[model samples]
Target: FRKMAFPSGKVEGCMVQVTCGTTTLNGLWLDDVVYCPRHVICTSEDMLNPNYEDLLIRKSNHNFLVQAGNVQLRVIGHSMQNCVLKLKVDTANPKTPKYKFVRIQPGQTFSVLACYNGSPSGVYQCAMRPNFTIKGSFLNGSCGSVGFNIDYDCVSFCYMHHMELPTGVHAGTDLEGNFYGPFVDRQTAQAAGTDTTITVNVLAWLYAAVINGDRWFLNRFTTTLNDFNLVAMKYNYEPLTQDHVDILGPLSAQTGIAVLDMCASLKELLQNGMNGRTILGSALLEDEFTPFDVVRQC
Candidate 1:
């Protein structure tokens, strides 16, 4: 959720070395280089020993304007000079997606509007809303194909669960008046196949239901867990066990009783570490899960 800029005073074609701490990531001519929060310590070679004359002191890279709902990247070139820019964008492809090329001069801004579709391994490009269409049904008319990318924060949250692609409403659903998050793993798995990566945020949602005092919602939550178990069985993946269901109903103070308190429990659940604990939970509370569980799940 940060923005990285360059100086217009320097030669327009000169490459500025972008680095993560001392390790060089890539060079930029004119690009909006954004890093995942607390991801990597980014630095530029030009920033090490700055030439006051050539130095372009601008806003911190962390201040770029972020689109709240979709993944739209807009950048402004402040100097009077012109520069070429490249930006990285997330597409359906989980690995490498695509980048956009543009030219900008002072007082100029460029934007790329992206949409998120459920399936993976598709093109990573942007266009106007009216320019695309899907072929199957009446719903596939002009505005059907193109959609917006999920928010940057949502993506980070999904990564928090070791899930990929936080696109679509499932990642952060507008349930009732509040938002529930980072459920893309479950959504994608259910949509695609059982072999795909998955995670059931049972504890998280159950905690939410309890906090809202929505007894009906709790019933729905139980049914959802039941569906997850059935689906997992059909898909040949591991299903939610009794321990997961146990955390759903009334929790004691030790396990956290309030919403925020339950949130603390969720934090411990999602924390990355190792022990005998499986993807579900441990036979012993002290046992933990590891990266291999995530890999196997995917």
Candidate 2:
């Protein structure tokens, strides 16, 4: 059994009692048995499918913690002096941390995109340069503000991982160019009382184009639908439908075109999969399910 390949240290000498017919087997046996830890932290698995919890945890009480997703960090110099701050991702390799230095104009609040590690899976560390002190807080769904203080000049940011990585994690379009985690779902938008007719109509056209073999628009249509799917997944929702769009509010030219491109690719994949089932149906045996096989015939 596949269980035989479990870690030798964890399962090698383990024992289980089993009885087959009248034969009773006890203690360690060379049978099919294994043990699995509830939460084993293996580096191989971490590399392939990292949970990222360790990196996102706050390491000190003096640090400001930001959630581990796309977020905005707001800073105010508070005086008529240029504010200089250094920002970096708290990577495991201390010598090779990723950092950026920014100069914020005094008395002006500056907002920059934080959590820029391509994915929501690490901590960000920031601090005002020597001779400068500034104050502000992270503005997002990730942090709770107990109080603000100028003395907490240094900040360590972390983000709460979304159930799924936000949409556009690996996508781009001419409209919005390149962005991430600005994902919006239909239900949430509707709750916020925003209209979504344009997004719905645009996607409907794309789906129709696929069914009618409109090859010229095929590429753009599928790409847009693909983008739509990622946004929905991030919100823990189902695939895009005619009633919903990923853009949170009123559609701009950038958002509109981007959504269309994403929906295009998503619809194309579904159509291809459906067609494949039809083509392979005839080759299947009677005992196997065909495209039109019954789920429950009463």
Candidate 3:
């Protein structure tokens, strides 16, 4: 987690960039940007990558301000997936489902921050509580959602995996706590379907709407994973790199699922680069899975 700055200063090379609106705040710009840690060359592997040619001084698109359980966990967070669905993933979509998802507020972006232990930390967005009401039930709502987008970063100590989010809607009872991550690969995760304990941390600087009075709030949250699976999504698919193969190889033995199942589509994507037709058809990329079989039981 970066330093908690009501108004932070600007540096030439941080994953985050700041674009101000004419005037500066506390010597900081108005429009701020942040980047994934991997995107930055902090690690030796990152520094030596010959292909690190186009490493632009990119900034994080947005920051999250989540209130997790602690404040000392300072592992820089990264973005895995920034998907904006026209409709929310409704597990009970085609059956006796009595609810209708009213789209996660459009144009809204999300971010994630993860750390192993300590006082816990948050992103650059605020956490919301009373704004969410699920039919007749109430949940201990934080200001954001974490999962997939809310990524975790650590090297060792691998038992309990957790994350934090800064933009989540209150789903009924099953989707409590904040969404944290989608993990590095599939098999490394608990199981296709298992409940994992997680923590939520919101950055007070980003979401002023929620963290308005006192200093800041660090929230502790937990939830179950009713769905878990991995897919080979990349800038390209064919000519899979050794690194790619190594990552997926473990999943085959650990999860008993073939790498092809997750990567075949991606292979096809790479085989046929990004054509105009495919770009238009990208909308249907997810339609491959029927609503009934969407959730992975294994």
Best by lDDT: 1
| Residue 146 Cα positional deviation in candidate 1, in Å, after optimal superposition | 14
Candidate 2 error regions (>4 Å): 1-156, 159-258, 273-298
Off by over 4 Å in 3: 1-22, 25-239, 260-262, 265-298
| Per-prediction TM-score | 0.21, 0.17, 0.19
Against the true structure, candidate 1 has what lDDT? 0.25
Between 1 and 2, whose lDDT is larger? 1
Q: All candidates' lDDT scores?
A: 0.25, 0.24, 0.22
Residue-wise C-alpha lDDT for candidate 1, range 79-185, written one tens digit per residue: 21111112232222222123232221111111111122111112221111111111111111111011122222221011100112312211111101111221221
**Model 1 stretches astray by more than 4 angstroms:** 1-191, 194-199, 216-238, 241-298
Residue-level error in angstroms, candidate 1, position 92? 27
Each model's total of backbone clashes: 4, 21, 44
Q: What is the RMSD, in Å, between candidate 2 and the native fold over all Cα?
A: 23.4
Which 10 consecutive residues of model 2 have the lowest summed lDDT?
Answer: 76-85
Instruction: Rank the candidate models, highest lDDT first.
Output: 1, 2, 3
lDDT by residue for model 2 over 228-289, one digit each (tens)?
66754553334554334433122323234344554554344444433433211222111111
How far is 262's C-alpha from truth in model 1 (Å)? Answer: 13
